[PDB]
Design an enzyme around this catalytic site. Structure first.
Site, mmCIF file in Angstrom:
data_model
loop_
_atom_site.group_PDB
_atom_site.id
_atom_site.type_symbol
_atom_site.label_atom_id
_atom_site.label_comp_id
_atom_site.label_asym_id
_atom_site.label_seq_id
_atom_site.Cartn_x
_atom_site.Cartn_y
_atom_site.Cartn_z
ATOM 1 N N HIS A 68 0.825 -1.211 0.000
ATOM 2 C CA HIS A 68 0.000 0.000 0.000
ATOM 3 C C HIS A 68 0.863 1.266 0.000
ATOM 4 O O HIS A 68 0.818 2.079 0.932
ATOM 5 C CB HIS A 68 -0.990 -0.009 1.167
ATOM 6 C CG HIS A 68 -2.097 -1.007 1.016
ATOM 7 N ND1 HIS A 68 -2.142 -2.184 1.730
ATOM 8 C CD2 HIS A 68 -3.200 -1.002 0.230
ATOM 9 C CE1 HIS A 68 -3.224 -2.861 1.393
ATOM 10 N NE2 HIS A 68 -3.886 -2.165 0.487
ATOM 11 N N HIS A 72 1.383 1.838 -5.718
ATOM 12 C CA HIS A 72 -0.009 1.396 -5.726
ATOM 13 C C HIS A 72 -0.970 2.551 -6.018
ATOM 14 O O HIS A 72 -1.931 2.391 -6.780
ATOM 15 C CB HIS A 72 -0.344 0.722 -4.391
ATOM 16 C CG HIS A 72 -1.782 0.330 -4.247
ATOM 17 N ND1 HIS A 72 -2.368 -0.658 -5.009
ATOM 18 C CD2 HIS A 72 -2.748 0.788 -3.417
ATOM 19 C CE1 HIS A 72 -3.635 -0.785 -4.660
ATOM 20 N NE2 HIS A 72 -3.892 0.082 -3.698
ATOM 21 N N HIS A 106 -6.105 7.521 -2.114
ATOM 22 C CA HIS A 106 -7.015 6.563 -1.466
ATOM 23 C C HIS A 106 -6.395 5.684 -0.372
ATOM 24 O O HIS A 106 -7.119 5.143 0.462
ATOM 25 C CB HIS A 106 -7.723 5.694 -2.511
ATOM 26 C CG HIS A 106 -6.921 4.517 -2.962
ATOM 27 N ND1 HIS A 106 -5.832 4.632 -3.799
ATOM 28 C CD2 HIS A 106 -7.047 3.197 -2.690
ATOM 29 C CE1 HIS A 106 -5.322 3.435 -4.023
ATOM 30 N NE2 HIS A 106 -6.039 2.547 -3.361
ATOM 31 N N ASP A 107 -5.072 5.529 -0.398
ATOM 32 C CA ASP A 107 -4.340 4.750 0.610
ATOM 33 C C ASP A 107 -3.289 5.589 1.331
ATOM 34 O O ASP A 107 -2.291 5.060 1.818
ATOM 35 C CB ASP A 107 -3.671 3.523 -0.021
ATOM 36 C CG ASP A 107 -4.591 2.323 -0.089
ATOM 37 O OD1 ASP A 107 -5.427 2.138 0.821
ATOM 38 O OD2 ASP A 107 -4.475 1.552 -1.059
ATOM 39 N N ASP A 217 -8.789 -0.497 -7.620
ATOM 40 C CA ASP A 217 -8.044 -0.924 -6.435
ATOM 41 C C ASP A 217 -7.456 -2.326 -6.605
ATOM 42 O O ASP A 217 -6.374 -2.618 -6.095
ATOM 43 C CB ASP A 217 -8.941 -0.871 -5.192
ATOM 44 C CG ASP A 217 -8.152 -0.707 -3.896
ATOM 45 O OD1 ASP A 217 -6.973 -0.302 -3.938
ATOM 46 O OD2 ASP A 217 -8.726 -0.974 -2.821
ATOM 47 N N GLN A 269 -5.675 -17.305 -4.073
ATOM 48 C CA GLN A 269 -5.876 -16.422 -5.222
ATOM 49 C C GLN A 269 -7.066 -16.884 -6.060
ATOM 50 O O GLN A 269 -7.915 -16.077 -6.432
ATOM 51 C CB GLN A 269 -4.612 -16.354 -6.086
ATOM 52 C CG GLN A 269 -3.471 -15.549 -5.477
ATOM 53 C CD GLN A 269 -3.714 -14.048 -5.511
ATOM 54 O OE1 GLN A 269 -4.115 -13.494 -6.536
ATOM 55 N NE2 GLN A 269 -3.464 -13.384 -4.390
HETATM 56 C C1 LIG Z 1 -4.547 -9.902 -6.068
HETATM 57 C C2 LIG Z 1 -5.111 -9.071 -4.946
HETATM 58 C C3 LIG Z 1 -5.451 -7.732 -5.137
HETATM 59 C C4 LIG Z 1 -5.968 -7.006 -4.062
HETATM 60 C C5 LIG Z 1 -6.134 -7.628 -2.822
HETATM 61 N N1 LIG Z 1 -5.790 -8.920 -2.685
HETATM 62 N N2 LIG Z 1 -5.912 -9.638 -1.501
HETATM 63 C C6 LIG Z 1 -5.451 -10.867 -1.848
HETATM 64 C C7 LIG Z 1 -5.358 -12.067 -0.935
HETATM 65 C C8 LIG Z 1 -5.979 -13.267 -1.641
HETATM 66 C C9 LIG Z 1 -6.080 -14.431 -0.683
HETATM 67 N N3 LIG Z 1 -5.057 -15.239 -0.329
HETATM 68 C C10 LIG Z 1 -5.526 -16.158 0.536
HETATM 69 C C11 LIG Z 1 -4.731 -17.245 1.181
HETATM 70 C C12 LIG Z 1 -5.346 -18.151 2.046
HETATM 71 C C13 LIG Z 1 -4.597 -19.161 2.646
HETATM 72 C C14 LIG Z 1 -3.232 -19.267 2.387
HETATM 73 C C15 LIG Z 1 -2.615 -18.365 1.522
HETATM 74 C C16 LIG Z 1 -3.363 -17.355 0.921
HETATM 75 C C17 LIG Z 1 -6.875 -15.898 0.711
HETATM 76 N N4 LIG Z 1 -7.186 -14.839 -0.046
HETATM 77 C C18 LIG Z 1 -8.534 -14.225 -0.157
HETATM 78 N N5 LIG Z 1 -5.084 -10.859 -3.162
HETATM 79 C C19 LIG Z 1 -5.298 -9.634 -3.688
HETATM 80 MG MG LIG Z 2 -7.079 0.773 0.985
HETATM 81 ZN ZN LIG Z 3 -5.628 0.641 -2.427
#
Ligand SMILES: Cc1cccn2nc(CCc3nc(-c4ccccc4)cn3C)nc12
Ligand SMILES: [Mg+2]
Ligand SMILES: [Zn+2]
Length: 312
Positions: A68, A72, A106-107, A217, A269
């Site tokens: 952030h 970004h 925004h951040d 975002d 992901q």
């Molecule tokens: C690509 C991107 C853009 C903006 C925001 N984010 N936020 C993330 C975390 C994604 C995520 N990663 C896990 C995870 C769960 C267990 C083990 C390892 C990873 C769960 N989630 C929802 N990606 C992004």
């Molecule tokens: Mg934010």
């Molecule tokens: Zn942001």
């Protein structure tokens, strides 16, 4: 030096693209923002000395956290530029002014900690901000910079339009709280499916702008695969740093913030794309058809993560 800066002619054609990666041009980001402002709003919509002073002060108020950060801010601003340029007429001159400034701010002053951390661990910021903790602080930081000597880029505006523009900004920054997105997208999906969505409706307008802020975002999922993967590294590095602080406090963090559970990143992901990203760009492409390349690139990166899972 920012007032004398000129954009290379090769960047002029590529900056218009949705998938453009700002990454390789760090020294040009302030000038890239200026360029984007002049192309979207016009060459005279801000006082050049005030704008360049505002930009460098915004840059200074971003911390050196893994994700952030200043990079970004400009990345989100660029994605908004491409959305505005491909849908220029649907938005007012004041909306274009506010949304680009909002995306850059925004951040502002982000610490690298989620809203949940600040609330659960009784951080001062969560005391004065009940919901959307950091997002309300980000807008508070934006006003603080605006109220500095020679930074007020909206000073040439009437008091009617000054209060009008920072309301666009306030609503746009608050919309970047991902907690509010899930409800917003459902309503917009409903408004579209029933054929009852109206851009002249002001509540609908703030909501479309809201979805646009989320789309910008999250736009790291809309770049070319290698850029998308490299950004993910920066995202988790920040998450894991938050998860370490919870571990030092004795509490096990969620697997997303646990570096010892990094094997489940591809599936994490995959879940984020199917639950958050794909739905976001699907609804945005429906409302604003020229935004389709964002959904196309997001779908391409989805299959890439699918390709990672099955060991290909
Ligand atoms: C690509 C991107 C853009 C903006 C925001 N984010 N936020 C993330 C975390 C994604 C995520 N990663 C896990 C995870 C769960 C267990 C083990 C390892 C990873 C769960 N989630 C929802 N990606 C992004
Ligand atoms: Mg934010
Ligand atoms: Zn942001």
């Amino acid at each position: 030096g920012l007032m004398q800066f000129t954009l290379p002619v090769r960047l002029c054609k590529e900056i218009e693209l949705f998938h453009f990666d700002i990454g390789p041009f760090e020294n040009m980001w302030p000038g890239i923002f200026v360029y984007m402002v002049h192309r979207s709003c016009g060459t005279s919509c801000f006082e050049l000395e005030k704008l360049c002073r505002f930009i460098m002060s915004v840059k200074k108020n971003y911390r050196r956290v893994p994700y952030h950060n200043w990079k970004h801010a400009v990345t989100v601003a660029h994605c908004m530029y491409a959305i505005l340029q491909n849908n220029h007429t649907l938005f007012t001159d004041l909306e274009r002014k506010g949304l680009l400034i909002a995306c850059l701010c925004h951040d502002l002053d982000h610490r690298g900690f989620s809203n949940s951390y600040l609330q659960k661990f009784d951080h001062p910021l969560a005391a004065l901000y009940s919901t959307s903790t950091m997002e309300q602080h980000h807008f508070s930081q934006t006003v603080s910079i605006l109220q500095l000597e020679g930074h007020n880029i909206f000073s040439t505006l009437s008091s009617s339009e000054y209060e009008q523009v920072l309301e666009i900004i306030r609503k746009a920054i608050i919309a970047t709280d991902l907690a509010l997105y899930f409800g917003n997208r459902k309503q917009l999906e409903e408004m579209y499916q029933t054929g009852s969505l109206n851009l002249n409706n002001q509540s609908h307008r703030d909501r479309v702008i809201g979805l646009m802020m989320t789309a910008c975002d999250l736009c790291s999922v809309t770049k070319l695969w290698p850029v998308t993967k490299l950004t993910a590294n920066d995202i988790y590095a920040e998450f894991w740093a938050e998860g370490d602080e919870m571990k030092k406090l004795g509490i096990q963090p969620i697997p997303m913030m646990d570096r010892d559970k990094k094997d489940e990143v591809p599936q994490g992901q995959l879940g984020f794309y199917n639950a958050v990203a794909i739905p976001c760009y699907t609804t945005l492409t429906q409302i604003l058809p020229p935004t389709e390349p964002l959904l196309k690139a997001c779908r391409d990166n989805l299959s890439q993560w699918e390709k990672v899972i099955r060991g290909e």
